[PDB]
Amino acid sequence: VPATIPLTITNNSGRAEQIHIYNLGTELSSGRQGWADASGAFHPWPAGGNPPTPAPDASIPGPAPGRSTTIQIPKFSGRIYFSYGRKMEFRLTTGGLVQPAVQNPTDPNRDILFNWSEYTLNDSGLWINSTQVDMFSAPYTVGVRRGDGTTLSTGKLRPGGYNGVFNALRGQSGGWANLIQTRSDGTVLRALSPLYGVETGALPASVMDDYINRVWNKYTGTDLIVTPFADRPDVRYTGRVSGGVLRFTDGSGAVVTTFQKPDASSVFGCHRLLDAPVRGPISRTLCAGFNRTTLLANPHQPDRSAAGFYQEPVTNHYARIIHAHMADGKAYGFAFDDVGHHESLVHDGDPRGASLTLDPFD
Ligand SMILES: OC[C@H]1O[C@H](O[C@@H]2[C@@H](O)[C@H](O[C@@H]3[C@@H](O)[C@H](O[C@@H]4[C@@H](O)[C@@H](O)O[C@H](CO)[C@H]4O)O[C@H](CO)[C@H]3O)O[C@H](CO)[C@H]2O)[C@H](O)[C@@H](O)[C@@H]1O
C-alpha cells in the first residue's frame, strides 16, 4: 500500500454553501494526533490543555456543487469531516483532539450542519465507513476502488430516505421525536442516536425494561447459546439466568463472564453493563441481540439473517428506521451493527483510491 491514496470528494448535495473538509486523526508511523492537508502532509496538533484549548484551523476547501476535489489520504486512522457554510470548532485536551459532542446544547458545533466518515489506511489496506452511531445528519456515501479496479460503496440512502428517516422518528411515540434537533425556521439539523437520547432525557433509562425482563425470564428456564466467532462456529458459550444474573459457561464448564440486567444506555451505547472489552465477543453478540430485539425469539445467537430484526413494538427504532431507508439495507445504527455483517463499511487490502460523496437532502 502506497504512502497515500487519492480520496475523491464529490458535492452532489444540491446545496449552495461552501464545504469545509477536515482530515483529523492519528498518523500511523509516529502515533501522533493531528491533521492532514490536501497533499496528504501530516501536521501534528499543538499541545492542548485542561481545560481544552482551541485547535488551529485544519480545514481544506471542499468541492463546489456538481464538482469533485481530490485529497491525498496518508496512512492514518481518523475521520473525514465535512461542514456546510460554517467552519467547525475543534479543541485540544491534554491527550489530543476532543470530538464534538452535539448532544450538548453548549457544544460549539451544535448549530453547524456537518458529518463525518471514519477510516483507517494502513499497511493492510483501507477500511472506510458511513456511521450513524452518534447522529443522523448530512447524508453521504463512501467507497473504495479496489486493487482489481472494482468499486465498493455504501452509506447511500434511498430516494426520499433523508426526510423519511426524520418523519419516521417524529412519529415514533415514547420520546424518539425529542431526538430531533430542529432549526428555528423548522429545518431539521440532525437526529441524535438513542444513546444520546437517554443522556439528554429524550428517552428514559427504563425504555427497554419490559423486553429485558422477558429475556431474563426466558433464559432462567432455557439456555442462551452464543457462538460469537464467525470463523469458529464450534466455539460456544451457554448462558443461563440464576440469582438475577445471566452467567455464561464455556465448553470446559467454567463460568467465564456474567451480565447484570442492562438498562437503556447500556443497550443503546453497547457499554456500561454491556461493556465489551472472552467477555468482549459475547457482549458484542448480546448487544446486537438487544438492539435488534432478537434474543427472545432466537436462543442461538447471533442471528443468521436480518429477517427477524426490529419486530418488537419497543426496539431500537432509530436503527430500524435507518436500515429501512438505506439503499443496501446496511447501516451503523448502533456500535455493534457489524454483528452479522450488517454495517455500512467497505474495505480492500490493496486500495489505490477512495471516495466520499456528499449526498442530496432527499
Ligand atoms: O460500545 C461501543 C464500542 O465500539 C466503539 O466504536 C465503534 C468503533 O470501533 C468503530 O470503528 C471502526 C472499526 O471497527 C474498523 O476497524 C477495522 C477492523 O475491522 C480491523 O479488522 O482492521 C482494520 C485495520 O486495523 C480496522 O480499521 O475501522 C473503521 C474505520 O472505517 C472504524 O470506524 O466504528 C463504529 C461505528 O462508528 C463504532 O461504533 C468503541 O471503539 C469501543 O470502545 C466500544 O466498546
The answer for residues whose C-beta is within 8 angstroms of residue 286's C-beta and 6 or more apart is: 226, 259, 274, 295, 301
Q: Report the distance separating Cα 269 and Cα 282, nearest Å.
A: 16
**Nearest alpha-carbon partner for 216 in 267, 249, 260, 276:** 260
**312 has catalytic annotation:** no
Of all protein residues, the one whose alpha carbon is nearest to atom 24 of ligand 1 is 120
Resolution of the structure in the document, Å: 1.8
The one-letter amino acid code at 95 reads G
SS3 state of residue 142? strand
Give the chain's largest Cα–Cα span. Answer: 63
What are the grid coordinates assigned to 338, written together?
457489524
Look up cell 437526529; give the residue.
191
Q: Report the distance separating Cα 50 and Cα 74, nearest Å.
A: 30
Question: Where does 1-203+316-362 sit in CATH, by number?
Answer: 2.60.110.10
SS3 state of residue 211? helix
The runs of H, that is alpha helices, within the chain are 161-170, 194-200, 209-221, 264-269, 279-291, 317-325
Question: β-strand 151-154 against 135-136: which pairing, if any?
Answer: unpaired
- Phi first, then psi: what are they for 147, rounded to 5°? -50, -40
Residue 338 Cα, ligand 1 centroid: separation in angstroms? 9
The one-letter amino acid code at 324 reads A
Q: Report the distance separating Cα 9 and Cα 71, nearest Å.
A: 8
Residue 333 Cα, ligand 1 centroid: separation in angstroms? 13
Q: Report the distance separating Cα 79 and Cα 64, nearest Å.
A: 21
The torsion defined by the Cα of 62, 64, 67 and 71, in degrees rounded to 10, comes to: -10
Burial 300-321 (b: 16+ CB within 10 A, else e): ebbbeeeeebbebeebbbbbbb
Domain ranges of the chain: 1-203+316-362, 204-315
Q: Do domains 1-203+316-362 and 204-315 have the same CATH topology?
A: no
**Nearest alpha-carbon partner for 169 in 188, 150, 145:** 188
According to CATH, the topology of domain 204-315 is Metal Transport, Frataxin; Chain A (3.30.920)
Q: Report the distance separating Cα 191 and Cα 185, nearest Å.
A: 16
Of all protein residues, the one whose alpha carbon is nearest to atom 18 of ligand 1 is 127
**27 has catalytic annotation:** no
What are the grid coordinates assigned to 27, written together?
498518523
Using most ligand atoms within 8 A of CB, pick from 118, 199, 231, 348 the residue to mutate for ligand 1: 118
User: Looking at 222-334, which runs of residues are DSSP E strands?
Assistant: 224-226, 237-242, 245-249, 255-259, 300-301
CA angle 139, 145, 147 (to 5 degrees): 155
Solved how?
X-ray
Alpha carbon separation from 22 to 19, 97, 138 (Å, rounded): 10, 13, 15
Ligand 1 atom closest to residue 128's alpha carbon, by position in its atom list: 31
